[PDB]
Amino acid sequence: SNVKDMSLAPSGHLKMEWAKRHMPVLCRIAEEFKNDKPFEGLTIGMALHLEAKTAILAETLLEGGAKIVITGCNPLSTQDDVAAACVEKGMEVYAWRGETNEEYYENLNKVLDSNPDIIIDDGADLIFLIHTERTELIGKIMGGCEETTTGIIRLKSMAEEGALKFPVVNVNDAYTKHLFDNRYGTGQSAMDGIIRTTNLLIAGKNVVVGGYGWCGRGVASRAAGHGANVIITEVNPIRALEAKMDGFTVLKMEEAAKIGDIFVTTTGCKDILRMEHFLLMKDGAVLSNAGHFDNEINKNDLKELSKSVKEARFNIEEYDLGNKKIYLLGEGRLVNLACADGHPCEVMDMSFANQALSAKFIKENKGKLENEVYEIPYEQDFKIALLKLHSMGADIDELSPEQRKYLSDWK
Amino acid sequence: SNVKDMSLAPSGHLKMEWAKRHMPVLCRIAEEFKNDKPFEGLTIGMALHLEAKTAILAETLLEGGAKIVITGCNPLSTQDDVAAACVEKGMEVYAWRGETNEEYYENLNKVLDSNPDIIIDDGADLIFLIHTERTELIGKIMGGCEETTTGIIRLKSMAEEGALKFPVVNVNDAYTKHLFDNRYGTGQSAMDGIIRTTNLLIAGKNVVVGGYGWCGRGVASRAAGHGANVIITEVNPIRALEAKMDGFTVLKMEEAAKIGDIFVTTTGCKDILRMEHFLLMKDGAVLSNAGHFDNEINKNDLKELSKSVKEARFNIEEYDLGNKKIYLLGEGRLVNLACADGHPCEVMDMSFANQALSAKFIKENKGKLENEVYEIPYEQDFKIALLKLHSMGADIDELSPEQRKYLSDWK
Ligand SMILES: NC(=O)c1ccc[n+]([C@@H]2O[C@H](COP(=O)([O-])OP(=O)(O)OC[C@H]3O[C@@H](n4cnc5c(N)ncnc54)[C@H](O)[C@@H]3O)[C@@H](O)[C@H]2O)c1
Ligand SMILES: NC(=O)c1ccc[n+]([C@@H]2O[C@H](COP(=O)([O-])OP(=O)(O)OC[C@H]3O[C@@H](n4cnc5c(N)ncnc54)[C@H](O)[C@@H]3O)[C@@H](O)[C@H]2O)c1
Ligand SMILES: O=c1[nH]cnc2c1ncn2[C@@H]1O[C@H](CO)[C@@H](O)[C@H]1O
Ligand SMILES: O=c1[nH]cnc2c1ncn2[C@@H]1O[C@H](CO)[C@@H](O)[C@H]1O
């Protein structure tokens, strides 16, 4: 087991203590998993953003009988104290903050070295690595679960070509996931990363958000909530029109780059900000990324234009272009996880609840599932949404029998 | 042709002149229909909310070669001057404001008496009456178009039972329809109806919104925009959770009836507010409805509790319950259409663009379509949204081919 500093373990345990007390839906699932022990004898290899709430998810599976081998899905998002606390919990952990690309793929491989039965992934890199380099593990793998939009794109494009070799559950596209995780979760946590790292006033700034899907909406909403003038970029006209009618300025990036004070890319696509955009930017512009991979902002292009790169502050790099400066947060990686604590607890409670139950779904269908992407059933979303609603002290009306009849027969 | 007063026509012509200048997407389609004359020789029977913007759609179809027989789909939403101007334009009009239930169904039948080829309806009343009482018309009918959520519910359950006898295009569920007409359109137009009729200050009121679908969100956001304390009612926990995280109080209607100052029902279901809720309401509570039919508020219950019903102000009825008064706007009909001029022009431009092209789709697919509910293809939404985006002074970026390879390859 390979972690940064085992002496950091107490601080991580405390953070797990705090998180466990604020994830009620997962806490209930855990008690049911403590009995019925669904994962006894199985190995679950996990590649997630290793902080307190992931550690609780891993703990939920461990107490359910599973052996847990886990690594980080991002070189910068791991929290060393939490990882050390995970080893004290009895987990095989290969993760630290700041690992090289070379080291990143070493830790992924070591997780696969444990011969897992279930794969839990965030971005499909663990799943990808199996199909390309480690085909010798496909036999034992019962199935997987994928957390994020970008991972689903790859998995679906794999499945489309017929390259997918074991079932994978689409956890991202569940109603209680992408509607809350991607929107309200990154809405708060991305602004958290920016505010905590920069100590800059959001109000009165031009905040340029690339893309207006679920993540864009969230960031636009919370940035607008803090008094920003929000500008939206898109390639989808239906979604740009939403942004316009939500009160935002819609521009081609070649234009938004001229006036933006803070940039947040949320597209899942590469090269949102490249050479031509950097040359248009104002002195002092601050750059950040909330989409999975670090290639939305072209760092090689930015290094190419620069005469030097200095530390401007913790998690802020200064690129002196000679005539102006541009700041990059968290090396252009997930600004909410590279520069903050990730999504708030109550939102990750729902996402990891779907994750937990999806692993149980994989187990119970050991050999009966197709080599396809499976969608999460609506009742699971209904159950989780209702539990979360109640924990916040709200409730729902219920249709009377007469009302159900009016809505189903046409009289 | 049967209308209230032909002398009112000049006001109708002016209102149509004004709308035509603010419906650019439909204005383009009309010129193509004037050119290609797709409906030459055909009769189109239409049941829509007969105001200035519906008249433009009818005229657009008239210039496309069609004979137009139109009535209102609601007894109160018709504008008499617009109807008069419609007859001066050469349309067969059977509609006036405030028509009785027998008059409403007499006018519905008169439209069908013209033996139409294409049916354009809002709420499935024409399509329903055809299938039940006027079955001899199925032969000549090529197809239909349905405007609203409620109409689609009926049409889908009809088709599910095998009772649908000609194809109907689902105009409501188009992206450029329910995402903007039901949300932004209803958001502004319903609050206009409430504000315009009552002259009451929205800020500081407890506004109880029934339902949190597309119409619910719009009303809630616009009510909040004006400083109301928004309370949401729902039977869908996923959507109730949305409202909670958008900053609203979520309650069962029994608790909400105790504190609500203004009520807006947006459910499409009957009996949202009944006897038991009227007994809980505050003295002076204002009741309003934005769902298609007037049975979301149980008016029979309210009369039974009332010692008298009198005019309190134009479009306001005072129901004196003896110990308190309850006010009802627009006889519990579409508060944005019974008490105002309906959706804003820019929003109906998109909805009526889809209506026009779907009528063209029906004609060109004569005898080829099944007796099923047809969805509007994505390329139609794309074209419409892009056109609408451009007219509002914004534009969209485009992916380079290299960016298009990245989003499709799983490496
Ligand atoms: N904690 C986090 O930081 C977090 C959480 C959830 C998802 N994500 C990642 O964020 C990304 C999107 O999340 P989603 O759920 O919003 O996906 P989504 O697809 O709803 O949002 C994507 C939007 O980007 C737009 N887009 C694509 N290329 C563009 C371009 N070149 N210029 C402008 N706009 C463009 C698309 O039209 C789409 O609207 C994914 O990579 C996902 O993994 C991150
Ligand atoms: N101009 C207008 O006024 C206008 C425009 C569009 C649609 N509409 C009408 O408004 C209604 C809604 O349209 P939509 O597109 O919102 O449909 P939608 O179904 O998305 O919204 C309906 C919501 O009502 C909720 N609901 C149902 N019964 C309920 C109950 N008893 N208590 C609480 N919540 C309940 C459902 O869960 C759903 O979320 C439909 O009747 C539609 O025809 C009116
Ligand atoms: O605090 C967190 N812990 C674990 N996963 C997280 C956290 N915040 C966000 N994500 C998840 O990371 C993915 C993007 O790579 C998203 O799927 C999001 O849900
Ligand atoms: O001003 C208007 N003219 C015509 N139709 C309208 C207007 N406002 C709303 N609707 C339409 O009425 C239906 C609800 O019964 C909805 O489909 C909405 O699009």
Author numbering:
A (entry chain E), B (entry chain A): 22 to 432
How did the manuscript describe this experimental structure?
S-Adenosyl-l-homocysteine hydrolase (SAHH) reversibly cleaves S-adenosyl-l-homocysteine, the product of S-adenosyl-l-methionine-dependent methylation reactions. The conversion of S-adenosyl-l-homocysteine into adenosine and l-homocysteine plays an important role in the regulation of the methyl cycle. SAHH depends on the cofactor nicotinamide adenine dinucleotide in its oxidised form (NAD+), which is self-regenerated during the catalytic cycle.
Structures of archaeal SAHHs were determined from three organisms: Methanococcus maripaludis (MmaSAHH), Pyrococcus furiosus (PfuSAHH), and Sulfolobus acidocaldarius (SacSAHH). Regarding the structures of PfuSAHH and MmaSAHH with their preferred substrates inosine or SIH, the oxygen attached to C6 seems to form additional hydrogen bonds with the carbonyl oxygen atoms of Asp348 (PfuSAHH) or Asp362 (MmaSAHH) in the main chains. This suggests that the hypoxanthine ring is in the imino-hydroxy form, although inosine has been shown to be most stable in the amino-oxo form in water. Similarly, our complexes of PfuSAHH and MmaSAHH with inosine and the complex of SacSAHH with adenosine show a closed conformation state of the molecular gate in their active site. The absence of a comparable monovalent cation was observed in all structures of archaeal enzymes. Similarly, MmaSAHH tetramers and SacSAHH tetramers exhibited an average ΔGint value of −133.5 kcal mol−1 and −127.5 kcal mol−1, respectively.
